[model samples]
Target chain A: NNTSIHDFDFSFICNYFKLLKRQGPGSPEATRKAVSFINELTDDAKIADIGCGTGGQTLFLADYVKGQITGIDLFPDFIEIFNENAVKANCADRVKGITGSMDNLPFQNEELDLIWSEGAIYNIGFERGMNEWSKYLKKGGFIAVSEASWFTSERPAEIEDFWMDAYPEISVIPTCIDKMERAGYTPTAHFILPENCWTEHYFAPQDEVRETFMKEHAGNKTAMDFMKGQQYERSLYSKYKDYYGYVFYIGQKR
Target chain B: NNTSIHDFDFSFICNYFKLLKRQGPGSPEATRKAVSFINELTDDAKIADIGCGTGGQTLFLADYVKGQITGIDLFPDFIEIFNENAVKANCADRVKGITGSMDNLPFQNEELDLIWSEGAIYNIGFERGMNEWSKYLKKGGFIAVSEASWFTSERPAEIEDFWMDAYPEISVIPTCIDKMERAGYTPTAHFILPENCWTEHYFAPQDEVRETFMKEHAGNKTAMDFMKGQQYERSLYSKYKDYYGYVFYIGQKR
Candidate 1:
């Protein structure tokens, strides 16, 4: 009864997400905590935000950080809306959103003082993103990213299968820490984002978006089918969220 | 049939705990993480470890901290062992253990530079302990304590009952944080102790001690009854630990 997000067209996915308050599961408090792990940023520091959908966390960084933040995402629609939000928030000069992919970041070697992503690193896979993006981060630079992590080595099969089908790269937190260390970054600090990131931040707003979404595309077969998938995902989360959740890992380049 | 810890005599509890490596559920890494939140300590800083059973976490602190540590526990057996361990560790000059109760802590007003407790504040109760202990801590002094906390306000009936029976005062982490703020402290940092703190550091060592205990108590009805209670507690933890676990709260007194 559930269709995977992978079944939907990329544009359909973008359209559905662009209307939401946050593109992914996250909270501003989680963003603030991740930033606290970062030691310091220079006045002229350069920061790259990979897969920064709709600039949810990017805007928070812009408010606190005195640095240039380049937000990159795969979807052009997201970037268009992101730039608009940045402009409206009056941080357009320091924070700019552009269409880009995590696999192919638009940055030179060792040019970034900080690289941040929230609930988006699984795009290019966690290990690959950390390894590939580390090249763009200067020595002693910080990288903070949040990804789904297993709390235990063994998990209940249903939740395990759900996550495995969604993102095969999902690993236990210790393994992610190991990968971060192997990816030429010191695993400085990491913490699990609280349950509210899903029930309160992501799904709560998604519910409002869904109401208008259903109204906007009444009887549209595929859009309605998409609704089943979202509901199924939320149901699974409600049932098995204790088994896993997004963990923010803060790392400093070696 | 299951037995509650409350049913056992205080001497029986102390005897069982003294024979074990650790008195309660915790890990050295968890202790290390809690210490990281405290800003600093002076060379002559006075540190108090309330309910410092067997000094499992206390020894780790003594190794790294440059200050005098006074470990206080109600059970003289545990205190004797704690002081012995400190002497064997060759830190007796700086680290000492004494018999005392949390309700009546032996410290003057603003006399302590830091107060640390792990898995023991439940004795005096979380809110009451924090409120009462603040008088012993100087302005800007740190209080780091770990307590069992609910992950969500609503929990499954079985797990909820298990915890409610075990600790009637177990509140969700947010409530604990709020209590800390109201208890004249600036809540600085808090984190959940990992699963291994229960599985590896706690139960694994507990299993070995159980073997020796069984041998020592051979066929004693009450001791065997105690075993049933402990086993039942472990069974409940295995099934429902995800709903709850130890959370370390680091707060600085106003």
Candidate 2:
């Protein structure tokens, strides 16, 4: 009855992610706000960004908080761009990108002062990431992640079904907060990502990709089908944007 | 080497416009602002709206200004809907819609207290409409019309070419004001329509038509092509929206 990322080849997602400046729905405003709730950070404090696609938000974090940072992503293609961008921009002192998975990390237990993810926790599942990643954080450390969330308890059926099909783990904000609390987080702060983050920042870039890819592969039916999916997602977003969006959730690890 | 309304069959446009609440980009705010520039309006005063497709702006005028309004359009279909709306809404004094072309108005010379058109002057051409329609307005009467205008004298070549193809009469505000002055009126006021007029009011309704038509005519390749044209126009607007848009130009006849 529906289509999701699962229908598309895994490689298609990586290719799509490669073109986007930021892989998800977020902005520096949300990034700064999340950092504001977490008080202490030293120049030498260690931070890890899980599922940090191309280190876009990682550089944003560098501007807000003081830390030696490592960005982990499953794709080396993304990591290469991340490092290349760091070198070109001289990103707040070579905050490097390392190839790794969110579920498994090279960082030792309790070694990091903060763990950050922006619109990326769905990789390992939000609740599982909240529970498991905290083990690698110091007792006083913080974890901040943004996940897709429902604004209202009830939404129109079309949007409801679409989200459920797209991401079965989707839940309302209170349920998300409860999940965070159950995962041993004190639940410090959370807010919906601002409208422009999706409208202007994330979706705007796809427009460039749309023209680029549509023309480059004009004759390819498969590519046209993929573009249709992207277009449908955008159409649905505008229609039902009031009902659901990405929410930033920050909490301290117990 | 381009596409414009001229490329499409005439009936296609009439049908496309029939689905819209507004045939063009405009709002009550724009209608009110334009009305405010013209000082004297009376319940007995006569007003003529040229090329007033579906009387969208005509209804808005009924709310703000006091006068009998005759909304003239080329299409009976639009006039039918416009009159139907008036009947249902109990429009102020039944501002009537009549099937008539802007170029050949039924009203006598110097019959109208005010001449009004919104985002529809391109039908008769902008400067030509300004010069020709002034004869319909009484001495010391008013004329208010919105036309597609370039915000800057110099715009990117692509948009420049598109406008040249779409409406060769499109000009920068200064040139438009100069044309109005040459036509016999002292330009009272002009302002760009709010962005919402396009992004929200006009284009938002098209989204409904898009889904409806795409599904209803799913098997027809011609329908698919028409939808593609609609999509491309929207994409172009978002890309170069700042470069050009509808601008309300109101003036008093000498």
Candidate 3:
């Protein structure tokens, strides 16, 4: 049989959303809470996704914003693929993939009404991305950046040392809240997840997913290749679960 | 409704492999002709996969190899996941993932009787990976590496430039045949798939698999993500008949 065309794992996106939804914007309990928060937001929202990877969360935010989304990424291939993905989503025109960097955005000053970043902002330095990019938003525009910060509690030296190098700007939630306030932004809400979202999100499903794929197609090359992908998925971004971890801050620009 | 797990597009993998299965192993038709070529040799061949992305071809080859199989990749996470998958497929003992680089392979010389690589050798440089890693196999071991070449009667300048930067060493099938001969191996077979494989595979019933997911969980985050993926399936990579070009190379190490 010409089973060649029968090989792509389109489930990647599905699994991705599953992890996020399980994490529920933060935890299984908070899933509804976060959506309710976004639902209650007032005014016309123009959410800017800085360094949106394939517009995963970009589209998620767009669901609530109900307005144009400006998605910026550094890779052209990613832009093209993401654009293709957006067009498929029937939100191509509404969700734009701009080819640029977070350091020097191409938007006009005070153009954006809100800034929403998922896993970025840390790349260009949180403080810099926060202070410098804040200039592009309206005075009262809200900027919600998801950051994994150092725990408010004490930890082992080994863990502290790891995050210090991985993310130098990472301080406790209170410290970041102070930083935001000093930067002229009022922190409306700041929540730190109790533990790394990994155990609830990744570790559980990955084992199940791998087992399912392998069971369906034993000794399959495509399944094997995807196994490597599963590994990267587990390890690549996991350090955040420990030391300084993911935190989403909703703040209004002064 | 708690629609937790999302599905991948099997059609994409099927379409990708179909292109290769019909196309010979070296040039564009490699995946198409590879199975038959390998079958003609040792029916009980043990195969090794290098950078087997998702194990599409690895699983396909599993149908014919009828013996032990080993897959190697840089990602230990993927390897562990692949192992889980292998167990699910009931090929746990036969299939395994090794975490290491092709440049510094951990396999004993002549340990793997057959080496199979698909869309992966390019990662470690074609000639270097093939030539250096070839030492791991015993004399008379089979080596199959798929490559994109500029051997057509009329080649596109754009494609030529793409291959030049991507694979500067891409030569005609005859040239590769000669290289294989010079490398102390006998070129067993080479084939290329014309555009026919594209139309046939794309127009298949893979969409039913996607629609099933959609119907089962409509409006759900995961279901929506799958729907978006299906749109991609109905278009580029499958539609527009862009699933073109593949080559297979089958050789036995001397």
Candidate 4:
């Protein structure tokens, strides 16, 4: 059943976006990475951001590519709001927001010269998105997407336990490479890295502010609050981390 | 339109709740003063979290209040997810999530014994929520809501512009008390705390592991990115903070 935008936990979302908007991109660390990522793209590229969310990465694609930019999201509300933001930033005319899903993208065959997705390809099944969305890209078109992957040669039982259910097809780099070739795409580059960006983005800066806040509102509702559902997740996977981390995949359509 | 859950912005809220949830009951410098405020609560209370976004405050409410806790939000998606959280915490049976808006509440006349709202009510028009939600509380029902009010008697033009539109009634304790009487309520206790709670919230010790997580995943697109809007906003109000800060409203139904 499709939950309407109003019904889809907006407070959670509002709180979430507030975090990223406040700390993610504007942070020097994020800006540097964005600049680096954008520099790698061609000057006149036609980039399409899939599952654009609220255009954080999509807008970056526009800045990096410095050409035509198209964004797609499953949420029309996000599209509407982001489009308004695009206009406010004076890039609306060049950036387009289409309401659609990754499983069923709304672009003509071989239309996109470059497809950029970050942290979203796994949502519709990584292999499925890879196999399906590739059909919409022109020959030699680049697809820059990131997904969680095993980091080590050995797939520990602990890591597999989580990914098996979370990302059913997750496996070694060689296995991923085999799948990429079988799906008719040449994997240009892929690498897994540490999970430091989050700390640099939110945790560090926030830690700096936590003390004074604790000192000021010790008895208020704020002090007793805690993030419950996810606290165990970190400890659950802390041991097997060497074998698993996020991987960025850069490839070209056949 | 609804976006897939994957397309939702999670990082921003994750960080905000993380900050709010990190607060503890006795960490404040003004622990004595802040505790005095909490001591004012009635035993076996029925507290309503007006904008219970993701149960950041609800979790705390479930802990501190020895009675029933009802969390109402305009967004059901958040409520639905939060319900799961409440269940996980084993408080679902006690903490109920009702889908409603602060602009208008869903309750009978003279029903709630105590209403505890944090960072909400302003959404329903500060003055309006004060004038309105007052009807649902039985005589002597206590409503505790936080309001962003002007810090000083000598108003700064810029600060006035920011809150005036949002809270036309945001003023000193004496002014707020006058308005409360007119709205069929009486102000009993109030807390005009310094922004130290905020400083502690953002500047505390680093959860090195969590920081590593965010750093590693810094560039990921998320909806919580909208929080950057506050930086632009601080230019308007940061300078005149001594005259105003978040005001906790402790009022009784007439």
Candidate 5:
């Protein structure tokens, strides 16, 4: 939960994640592939991107889809940065971000043609989010999210222990798909993100941020612990990526 | 239901499915991939291949696994052919076949280390099969089954109508995985079989059988109608393969 933010200085770990455009594992190419699987959405679809950390996927969606896009995140700083990115992209008027909780989204039920979330569904848990978010989508609307999942049955005890500490509820692909159907959505295509989405877009940049934070905040125990946790997490992925990875699941409201 | 057997002459339509070596869509390559995903099975694991028509995978398992394999099917003719295959493959000592219903499997409770089914779980239904078959498997035992599933949400009306009539309960991959967990197992990896599994292993061979049946059974309306049904089914896969596919799901008993 975001409650972990109170454990350390907000900017210490927050800024570290912000260094990379994506808060989780994803690539612009992956984003395009995920969107292409959603057949119900028209060119002018109204899309609400929940937990849109810094609008990494939002900007990509804006270019591919001719529609009004709203990027929502819990952090005020993230919303500010998202707005700045929109301005630079010259779509400030069409693309916008607002500070909002994913649980209590700022939209009417049955208004969203598509509800898109990337690597943030874990905040609300997959089942609850699918059930709660279904109301915001009209009948037959689509929802796409990328979640951490097991790629293999037999994972090393060390990596299993790491994920248990990190995200205890992390499940395999089929379980997530089942949750989507039980939550009243019909699942479509699901594809695992390439390992590079971790090394290339996320861990590579965040590793640099952790290095800088460790040097600047040498005497701060809390900041040092947080950076070490981030480093350990990245190292686990580097070693055990074949055992687990992120999968993009696309579904349509039944 | 096997009750549908009474709708036509028993040997008329039944012999057509029996003519081909494989009754469903799968290949030895795909079967090996599914087995590789299971972590708990040892070389000597006790395995039951339920609804394993003609032992396509059963014979393959005997060579790859040091385990004793039992192939079970509702059709006595299938069991007969499977036994002949085991003998011809020189695995008669390790591989055997029995005629039985999947719903009321002949195995004792907690006796099997693995329960493998392919293109036949739908006979007992995926949910009921998982729940029922779980009791037969020892703790930590594995279940690997190939099922027909929706790959994409967008599908043509004709194909949708066809499946609705054929297998109304056919669902997406995630839903099946969820059922595995709810039935008291931890789902592992699931992958869609390549399109060629249909063309190369199941359809193309079955097409030749259908053509022969049509020519030989001329003037037999019942046999002609059955052959047409087979042709329609194959054409549906050729055109709508992207929308639906056969997925192999592997899980371990919790």
Candidate 6:
């Protein structure tokens, strides 16, 4: 099921992280807000949720938009979870799950009205995804993606080093908007994700998982190293909440 | 009449340059296209046109919108031309002209619904103008500006050197949109101004003026130097039409 990252089943790293509602920081409210900025969607518009982990936003989108919604992820287990959730929500007819990578979108040119991704554009890089995925959007079609961005000009050295190694291309809001224009898209609106989006659903639960894993897997160097990585990220969030954030940028194909 | 720059009567440089239809490239069609992106304006919305040379867009905005429009510029002669043009169009009652520098916008806070500037934001710098002018706008109000930008990443050295000295702050479209967001505004839509906006109105008339000035002010060093600068800009447009262009960016207050 999980074929992309690694084979080991570490308690704090692999299995626990995979079973969460979403693989990243996001909320149904933020998803709804991001979708509201797009005006190109019709009642029967074709939609694709790229890198849709466990159908977090895919199910919500299917409920809100009267359109055929397809959720794509690289992990087979994630796709299974997505289809199971879709059936639970009674949206299985409108929502379907497919295991795939976002590196190359499998769709015809100019076939979609809206293409959405949350906390996943970094996999293929923001600029490259913006330039490549634009071909599949009809004229005036909308694309919305949430990406990690620096909210302040300066930050502490620890957080800086952590992000520099983690996501090197992270930049200020204006720089990201300029990239959108150069890639042949007209930006419509953008907003920073709230703090609850990170702490409430993602890190809060993951913190509990790490604590449980630490007691069970004593002296297990592999799981301990993975736990430290996530611990550092959560600590940065606690220390520098105002310095950086995830921003939702919405644009339309020109 | 021209108080911003040094006092001079150089033929090609000062007074004649002020009398032209527009100080930069733009058209009424582009103005309407930009205005259509804003959903915040009302029938009685108060509007301000910054750096409105000869009221090219000011008069057109007055005709399209059902509201009071005031045109502001530093040159008294240009404001005089604007008032004259407004009177000729029978919009003197709704459209008024004011002589002032855009450095300080003279309006109450949260008193305006739309603040429109066409081909004139470079005066205050794009980022500074966006951050400063946002105070006068009501919540959800719109601010639109057309600024010079590079359409492509690569450009010839001559055009690069020309703009480097003339307007160093000129940037790509996405960069401007980012500046809009940092300034507390949500970018809505941005598009490039058409070629006719330059060839038919601004360059066509200025080229005629330069030809006449060359014959009339022969061997005048000040006029000759200034004429060379204008001619270089026109020549760049002719040779590299796609490398650089002006873009209209529309945004709403957060």
What tens digits encode model 3's per-residue C-alpha lDDT throughout A1-254? 21221234445433333322222223442222233323244435566778775565666665655667888877554566567767888888888887898888888899887787755312675677778888888887777776766543555775566556546677655556556655666544444343434556435655665556667656766655555644643564464344345666666686
Model 2 interface RMSD, one decimal:
24.7
| lDDT string, candidate 1, A104-126, tens digits | 78899999999988874228889
Write one digit per residue (lDDT tens) for candidate 5, span A1-254.
Answer: 32233356555555666656788888887788676656544657788999898887789877666668899988887888899999999998889999888999999989988888888412788888899999999887889888898865558999887667667778877678778867877665566676678888777777566667668878977766776666677777878876788888878797
- Overlapping backbone residue pairs in candidate 4 total 62
- Which scores greater on lDDT, model 4 or model 6? 6
* TM-scores for every candidate against the unseen true structure: 0.56, 0.49, 0.38, 0.40, 0.60, 0.57
lDDT tens digits, residue span B1-254, model 2 = 22565666666667777777787889987788677667668798898888877777888888888888898888888889888888887973659988876777898899989999887423878788888887788988989888888755467899888888888988766567667766877555555676788888888888878778777877976566777776777888899976788878777787
The number of the candidate with the highest DockQ is: 5
Q: In model 3, which regions exceed 4 Å deviation? A: A1-45, A120-122, A193-244, B1-254
| All candidates: TM-score of chain A | 0.96, 0.95, 0.69, 0.71, 0.91, 0.88
Rank the candidate models, highest lDDT first. Answer: 1, 2, 5, 6, 3, 4
Q: How well does candidate 6 reproduce the true complex, by DockQ?
A: 0.13
Name the runs in model 4 displaced over 4 angstroms: A1-44, A84-89, A153-158, A202-226, A233-239, B1-254
CAPRI docking class of candidate 2 = incorrect
Q: Is model 1 an incorrect, acceptable, medium or high docking prediction?
A: incorrect
Q: Which window of 10 residues has the lowest lDDT sum in candidate 1 chain B?
A: B1-10
* Candidate 5 Cα deviation (angstroms), residue B186: 1.2
* lDDT per residue (tens digit) for residues B1-254 in model 3: 22111233443223223222221222222254465444343535556788764354566666666667788766554565567667777776777777777678777777777788866322665566667868887776778776654333345565554445545677654455556655656555443443433345333434435555556667566446644554543353342222124445666675
Off by over 4 Å in 5: A1-146, A149-218, A224-254, B1-6, B120-122, B210-212
* TM-score for chain A, prediction 3: 0.69
**How well does model 1 score by local distance difference test?**
0.80
* Model 5 DockQ, alpha carbons vs. true complex: 0.16
Model 6 agreement with the true structure over A7-59: per-residue lDDT tens digits:
34523343555656767887877777777667735568889999887777677
Question: Higher lDDT: candidate 5 or 6?
Answer: 5
Give the per-residue lDDT digits (tens) of candidate 1, residues B150-247.
Answer: 75446799888777777899986657766886787755556667678888887788788877899988778878888887788778788876567787
Chain B alone vs. reference chain B, TM-score for every model: 0.96, 0.94, 0.64, 0.70, 0.92, 0.89
